[PDB]
Design a protein around this ligand. Structure first.
Ligand SMILES: NC(=O)c1ccc[n+]([C@@H]2O[C@H](COP(=O)([O-])OP(=O)(O)OC[C@H]3O[C@@H](n4cnc5c(N)ncnc54)[C@H](O)[C@@H]3O)[C@@H](O)[C@H]2O)c1
Ligand SMILES: NC(=O)c1ccc[n+]([C@@H]2O[C@H](COP(=O)([O-])OP(=O)(O)OC[C@H]3O[C@@H](n4cnc5c(N)ncnc54)[C@H](O)[C@@H]3O)[C@@H](O)[C@H]2O)c1
Ligand SMILES: NC(=O)c1ccc[n+]([C@@H]2O[C@H](COP(=O)([O-])OP(=O)(O)OC[C@H]3O[C@@H](n4cnc5c(N)ncnc54)[C@H](O)[C@@H]3O)[C@@H](O)[C@H]2O)c1
Ligand SMILES: NC(=O)c1ccc[n+]([C@@H]2O[C@H](COP(=O)([O-])OP(=O)(O)OC[C@H]3O[C@@H](n4cnc5c(N)ncnc54)[C@H](O)[C@@H]3O)[C@@H](O)[C@H]2O)c1
Ligand SMILES: Cc1c(CN(C)C(=O)/C=C/c2cnc3c(c2)CC[C@H](N)C(=O)N3)oc2ccccc12
Ligand SMILES: Cc1c(CN(C)C(=O)/C=C/c2cnc3c(c2)CC[C@H](N)C(=O)N3)oc2ccccc12
Ligand SMILES: Cc1c(CN(C)C(=O)/C=C/c2cnc3c(c2)CC[C@H](N)C(=O)N3)oc2ccccc12
Ligand SMILES: Cc1c(CN(C)C(=O)/C=C/c2cnc3c(c2)CC[C@H](N)C(=O)N3)oc2ccccc12
Lengths: 260, 259, 260, 260
């Protein structure tokens, strides 16, 4: 009998034991929640399917957020088994590698722009809609993952910064849209973490080593600390919070100027 | 005047109520002279004349949905002008239906794509196609956003996300082009009745609320925005880049007004 | 055996069963923490004495934050039973009634400014210092209560906005100063709540009813929801968060304007 | 016949030819503005008298902002010379050297806090009040100088950050208070610069070189750019802007951090 006794949650974005979604799932399950998972993509099906099976779950559905049908079908299918859900976790972001390697101006093409904002920003709004029925029944909450590159320039984050900034604006509009129906909408601004979202990024732990020295706590966060924070936001303890962007970066965002 | 001999491109003049027209008017007031784009044949006719009331020809096709039209637009302008001291981006668009109803219900994928494409990417594309022409004279870039990116306004919906993406662009552009001495800034203008108000049922009632909340108890004008944009396109703004300047009579500063 | 098993916390600012500190204390106790209490003077003595005896505590010490000595003595006294401490909760704010009733320019005198910033802003920094040793022992955390009047203009809040804005800057400098020692520093920006901090403020109901109409969730927060959030920030689940201003206002802060 | 033909302005805070106020004064005068100046005490009299007459002005009044009387008297004096005023420039900040040299927690005493917030934050609100009548005559504007240490932690800036955070909140409440009367209130957040406010700061030069490396423009601002920008804010071109914090830092504030 944990904090999430009898509560259910959908987790989109588990790619490996390292994804931010995994640390979330572990924290939720650790507290008694029942879990469901999506995969983009059946390259990933087998790994996700009973990757679910550490979590007492078999509920594994295909969901590529580029296709409108895949979204609603995944929620109609997931509708078949579950009344509703007390939360939907959005841990999805993507942009064409080339748009994240070089000068922002030179490498940001129109297509690379479309995919970035499409996969990483609109997806959250689409899922929210297809999930609204399941969420009103249970007056669950929504949660997405953002990054403070939306508010500040980081080298090579480029169009992803614009996408995250759009995402963050969405959370606020979703919170007013769904707030009347008792559905809370929030996001976590996590510090940089070495996950599969770092593959192909040459600067990465040079970024990791910089964050380690600048963050007031002198360390980089983990998927556990992110999971624990996401757990709180998906819980009745966070019942008074909506449209909030919680920074889980060891306070990195608060430093103007460190001892070089 | 202050802008003696400097040149500026003005994209987004649709009518005499333009955010861009009032700015363009302010730019000319100080002696700079001007070039203009139009989205299609429609607006070709109206822009041609708006150019000639400011002593200008420089009137080129630019639908920001087409990549070619953009680069051609900066290629045409190369023939006439050595360089450019600034580019003014006053363009935004969404299916409108995405701006009428509940945010969740009415925000489809296409309406999202169009919103961010026309309203957010365009500035970055123009910035690129304009980079060479802008390096010649160490010009600057300027766009108009809306504080719906930070705060929820009813029926602004997907435009809020786009403007938020836009504002992030300004910062990355300013960091990218800053080494080139090219400044990148934006103006967050208060709401004002322009052709960007057609089809919005709540508008003036939005206008009447802003009139009561703004510390100054009034709504800004296209002139006041023009004057501010004039500064940002001027050497007086040489120390400012990646800045979002709020021209809303301070509305952005109130948490809540007397009922 | 709850989440705060064996953890102790100092609660500053319990004036009544409605105090924000009270909702905090209850949530901390709800999870098994041991509690300590301060009171500003005798008139306030009995209330903390019995408010402590409701959380299994008698540790009740006088602390008026206007006097330097009272602060350090309270922590020298509070030392007397406890080896160390896992957290200090700071829920204190005050300004001369007159300073908060009328035009900001006309009514903001120098002293009223002085008392405002002294009692409501510096106090947190002073307590933090006198609490540093006891906080290093257990690598505890610090928490204070703020209000979004620092960022945004509310009528009749006046100098309290400036003070809370100074407070919020303190959290960031404390978090950077004390973050090196593994001690986290964060604050909660709570929505308006009718407590004894509403006495003498006539606009409250139009305040409460307005926030109720604007907040995405269509309602005003409670000391329970604030307590629960503070509980999280004072817990290892918030180990990855420092220098954060957490908004507990039902998302009110995210609305630019609602159908007024 | 410049932009400020026939316009009048009060300038508080000219300490030397390096003062931020000095480059401001130069910019306003360059455009035809009427100028006035204050000095904190006798020692500085000779130099302020001399700077005024380099701008064709003698309007130089004693004003130490620690004393209430000196403020109103200084504005009582200038009531005598000028019908009204089109703007008041506030370029004053100060804190006890010791509070700006060392760990924030260790060196921030209550007094150093009191003086810091008193001289640097309340002064603007007091001046604003004493200036209201003359400012209503011509509905001029108010302007102060802030620093982004209010949002972000700068080493050794300490209590000055909290004061500037209070200052910035003041601008918003002043703008809301005085906006109805047509008086605009704004502030400039200037990049760091070697002025008389750099004496006694050992890290300054390393700070100057860091901003030069991080700022998108790869350089530090000058009093030219600060003077010119405030000139706008004191001008009818800025008639649609109030309660605004304009950053003149070569974009430094927008970087999360550049190439190492
Ligand atoms: N790792 C960090 O430092 C960091 C910081 C801030 C924000 N974030 C965000 O956290 C989120 C989760 O990342 P993570 O590190 O836990 O692991 P991750 O690498 O697995 O995140 C990417 C996930 O998005 C899914 N996805 C991508 N394209 C999809 C599509 N077209 N259809 C369906 N699904 C698709 C993938 O399944 C993938 O699991 C990311 O979106 C990231 O933007 C990460
Ligand atoms: N009016 C306000 O209250 C307000 C508030 C905040 C921001 N803004 C911004 O101000 C900007 C300028 O607005 P305005 O009021 O001066 O007049 P406007 O109505 O003409 O602005 C819209 C312009 O975008 C151009 N445009 C649209 N789609 C295009 C396309 N596919 N290709 C090329 N051009 C296209 C149009 O020519 C149009 O002139 C807006 O984009 C908006 O983001 C306005
Ligand atoms: N209630 C709200 O809507 C709201 C909103 C935002 C922030 N806050 C903050 O919450 C905090 C706590 O308020 P609460 O509602 O839980 O109960 P409360 O009314 O009791 O808060 C005031 C407390 O400050 C203490 N205090 C005042 N002067 C003191 C002094 N000189 N020395 C020592 N102690 C002194 C008092 O003991 C009192 O308990 C406030 O300080 C406020 O800044 C409240
Ligand atoms: N120099 C920077 O990098 C920088 C950056 C951001 C903000 N600022 C702010 O600009 C303002 C002025 O800084 P500066 O660069 O011109 O240095 P400065 O020393 O040349 O000017 C500051 C002036 O405040 C005056 N002053 C101090 N106490 C006073 C009192 N009690 N009464 C009357 N006058 C008093 C001083 O005489 C001084 O001339 C300050 O508020 C500062 O915090 C400076
Ligand atoms: C920190 C940091 C983040 C945080 N983060 C994970 C995000 O928010 C987003 C990631 C992201 C998006 N799209 C990607 C990839 C990663 C690469 C894998 C995938 N193979 C791909 O094709 N495209 O992204 C960065 C980008 C550059 C530099 C630093 C960072
Ligand atoms: C205020 C306010 C704004 C501010 N504003 C001017 C904007 O930034 C955006 C304008 C906007 C976007 N899309 C539009 C049109 C205008 C109509 C012409 C175009 N032909 C169209 O089809 N679609 O937008 C709003 C949207 C809904 C409710 C209120 C507002
Ligand atoms: C909202 C809002 C708050 C929220 N809140 C509790 C605070 O943050 C601060 C409270 C506060 C500060 N000082 C007070 C009192 C209360 C009254 C008790 C005591 N009688 C007194 O002398 N002085 O306070 C306001 C004050 C004025 C206008 C609006 C608000
Ligand atoms: C950069 C930077 C700033 C920005 N700056 C100019 C300010 O806003 C503040 C100046 C400042 C405050 N207090 C001072 C003095 C100057 C010295 C003369 C005065 N006589 C004094 O006794 N005390 O302040 C810093 C403080 C520490 C480290 C770096 C910085």
């Amino acid at each position: 009998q944990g904090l999430l006794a009898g509560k259910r949650f959908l987790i989109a974005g588990v790619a490996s034991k390292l994804s931010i979604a995994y640390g979330i799932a572990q924290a939720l399950h650790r507290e008694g929640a029942e879990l469901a998972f999506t995969y983009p993509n059946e390259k990933l099906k087998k790994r996700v399917d009973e990757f679910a099976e550490q979590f007492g779950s078999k509920l594994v559905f295909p969901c590529d957020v580029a296709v409108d049908a895949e979204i609603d079908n995944a929620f109609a299918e997931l509708a078949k088994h579950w009344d509703g859900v007390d939360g939907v976790v959005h841990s999805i972001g993507f942009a064409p590698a080339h748009t994240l390697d070089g000068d922002f101006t030179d490498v940001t093409d129109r297509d690379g722009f479309k995919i970035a904002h499409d996969i990483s920003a609109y997806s959250f709004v689409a899922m929210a809609r297809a999930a609204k029925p399941l969420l009103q029944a249970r007056q669950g909450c929504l949660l997405t993952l953002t990054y403070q590159g939306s508010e500040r320039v980081m080298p090579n984050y480029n169009v992803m910064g614009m996408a995250k900034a759009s995402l963050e604006a969405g959370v606020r509009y979703l919170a007013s849209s769904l707030g009347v129906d008792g559905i809370r909408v929030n996001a976590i601004s996590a510090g940089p973490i070495r996950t599969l979202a770092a593959s192909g990024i040459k600067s990465f732990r040079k970024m990791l080593d910089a964050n380690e020295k600048v963050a007031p706590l002198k360390r980089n966060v983990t998927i556990e600390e992110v999971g624990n924070a996401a757990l709180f936001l998906c819980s009745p303890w966070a019942s008074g919070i909506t449209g909030e962007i919680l920074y889980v970066d060891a306070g990195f965002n608060t430093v103007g100027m460190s001892q070089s």
